[PDB]
Write a protein that binds this ligand. Sequence first.
Ligand SMILES: [K+]
Ligand SMILES: [Mg+2]
Length: 222
Amino acid sequence: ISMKQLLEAGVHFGHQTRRWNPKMKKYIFTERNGIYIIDLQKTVKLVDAAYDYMKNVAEEGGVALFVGTKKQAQEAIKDEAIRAGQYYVNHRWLGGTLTNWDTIQKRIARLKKINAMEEDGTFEVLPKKEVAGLNKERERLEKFLGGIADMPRIPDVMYIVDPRKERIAVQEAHKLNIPIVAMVDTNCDPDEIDVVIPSNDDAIRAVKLITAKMADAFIEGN
RNA sequence: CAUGGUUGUCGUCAGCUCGUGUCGUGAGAUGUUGGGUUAAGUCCCGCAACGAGCGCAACCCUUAUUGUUAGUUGCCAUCAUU
Ligand SMILES: [K+]
Ligand SMILES: [Mg+2]
């Protein structure tokens, strides 16, 4: 990845100066027009390190979970996770998604069952109300758990966009001692993330750029 | 005022709870709250909650329309007689 690519994607932008986090001074370059500017030099070095780290995880046969519910990041992470073959959560991170993974597997099994009914033809012989109601249930299960329906075990690594937004996901990862690779913004906390990627979380182009790099790292590892 | 069984009562009011998860040193909390909606914890939406159970509802009986099968001890329009 290139510094010009980062700048074009707008990675450098941060949030308001008043809303920053002191720990981010380690990565902040300068403030312009009242908003902080991430140090793209450290960003390039750290994204390369994260690329290498994700590559190692992939080569180990590990499972990756891409997390982002930001309006900007939701669609981008879905596409890249699908492309990489690893699983994703993009609409809403359900509390206990991993700490209560055992419970969530029951809903995933329920989702698998409702899919089989369509293929089998139960829906055809199902009463109007039944099929309609079951279709609505299937829609909710897909909308929430769709991106992780086939995740075999607890992810070996969790990539996150804007942990400050994805507070709950970070907490579950810590509880399960799962490494976190996050797009950290000027108002976030870097201590919570093992592999920090100082970047703007509020730029769709930047999110696509960084997320695609991570997905390519996993693909290369495989 | 040792009990089983049976019953009244709030009240057919919409509540009462648990599993896992999470928060809290702890009793506890969350879900069950909140925006709507309903007769209803009824349902949708959002939510560190995700589900489930007892309730609610539905399945049951009766009443209100009707087809078909049946046509006597019931009914009498078409017919004649009493
Ligand atoms: K509990
Ligand atoms: Mg109920």
